[PDB]
Design a protein around this ligand. Structure first.
Ligand SMILES: C[C@@H]1O[C@@H](O)[C@@H](O)[C@H](O[C@H]2O[C@H](C)[C@H](O)[C@H](O[C@@H]3O[C@H](CO)[C@@H](O)[C@H](O)[C@H]3O)[C@@H]2O)[C@@H]1O
Ligand SMILES: Nc1nc2c(ncn2[C@@H]2O[C@H](COP(=O)(O)O)[C@@H](O)[C@H]2O)c(=O)[nH]1
Length: 269
């Protein structure tokens, strides 16, 4: 097989898909498979991809139901031990694929790096319970996951057109999938905000079904620093009895509520 599979969903990416592919082929010291999942691009996208006649590139061009449908198709076919997803507007940094192969040899099922968004580091969060009341903790395109990890967790849920990656990672956390965060930039990155938020809140309720939508939004804003946090102790007392995982998530995310978390663990778990 291969050390790495890179799944590249494309639709009308003719402007950048050549730079994206160059950043993958420049990776040395790893056997790499590339699976381009195109949704029927009418521009030069296929003409450009076919310029990269690497004997380890696969082109899938057929109607799909959105990016995560296209991602699902590529992950399903991936024959590499570690699988990564690279948008056509993104580029891998030098040496990242060997860094992923190195950290995977120890058995870690997920290897995640840093993300450069407009020359700024994405404000990542830790892969831990506290992620479950937030969005995706690391950049999706900076994540690599083994064949086993996908086989354990499943595919991306097409009900989420934006944050299906966050939902998958939360399922990974909840499934105790091993993760090692590498403090190196893996990718340089190239949608209505309301829709982003709506999907993030729904993903959070999927971890903790007892939360009203407003309550999930308050937690997201509290963790992301977008809103206040005075009502965290209220939320904790209201639902702490439900899940030890929920109590763990809030005390990690909001260290100010530790003494209150102690009480929930004591009276309920
Ligand atoms: C509407 C908001 O505008 C800005 O404040 C932006 O920074 C916000 O993005 C942050 O919060 C949202 C929830 C995202 O989690 C975003 O991370 C990105 O979200 C995707 C969702 O799964 C991932 O595909 C992507 O790789 C990841 O970089 C960031 O944390 C928000 O848009
Ligand atoms: N296969 C497929 N790829 C898509 C679709 N929409 C966007 N993409 C690709 O997914 C990546 C995300 O870019 P975005 O459009 O989200 O900025 C890009 O590589 C883009 O070309 C789609 O409907 N189907």
């Amino acid at each position: 097989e291969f050390d790495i599979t890179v799944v590249i969903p494309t639709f009308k990416a003719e402007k950048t898909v050549g730079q994206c592919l160059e950043s993958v082929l420049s990776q040395q010291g790893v056997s790499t498979e590339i699976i381009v999942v195109d949704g029927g691009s009418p521009d030069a996208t296929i003409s450009i991809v076919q310029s990269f006649s690497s004997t380890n590139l696969t082109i899938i061009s057929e109607p799909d139901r959105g990016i995560y449908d296209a991602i699902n198709k590529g992950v399903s076919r991936a024959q590499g031990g570690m699988i990564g997803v690279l948008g056509a507007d993104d580029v891998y940094k030098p040496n990242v694929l060997s860094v992923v192969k190195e950290n995977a040899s120890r058995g870690v099922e997920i290897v995640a790096g840093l993300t450069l968004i407009d020359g700024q580091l994405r404000a990542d969060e830790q892969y831990r319970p506290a992620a479950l009341i937030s969005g995706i903790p690391f950049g999706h395109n900076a994540m690599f996951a083994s064949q086993e990890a996908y086989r354990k967790v499943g595919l991306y849920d097409l009900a989420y057109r934006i944050c299906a990656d966050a939902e998958w990672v939360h399922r990974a956390i909840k499934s105790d999938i091993s993760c090692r965060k590498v403090e190196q930039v893996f990718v340089e990155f190239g949608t209505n905000p309301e829709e982003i938020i709506a999907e993030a809140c729904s993903v959070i309720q999927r971890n903790f079904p007892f939360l009203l939508k407003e309550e999930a939004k308050y937690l997201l804003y509290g963790v992301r620093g977008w809103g206040e946090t005075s009502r965290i102790e209220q939320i904790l007392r209201k639902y702490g009895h439900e899940s030890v995982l929920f109590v763990t998530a809030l005390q990690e995310a909001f260290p100010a509520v530790e003494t209150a978390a102690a009480l929930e663990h004591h009276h309920h778990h």
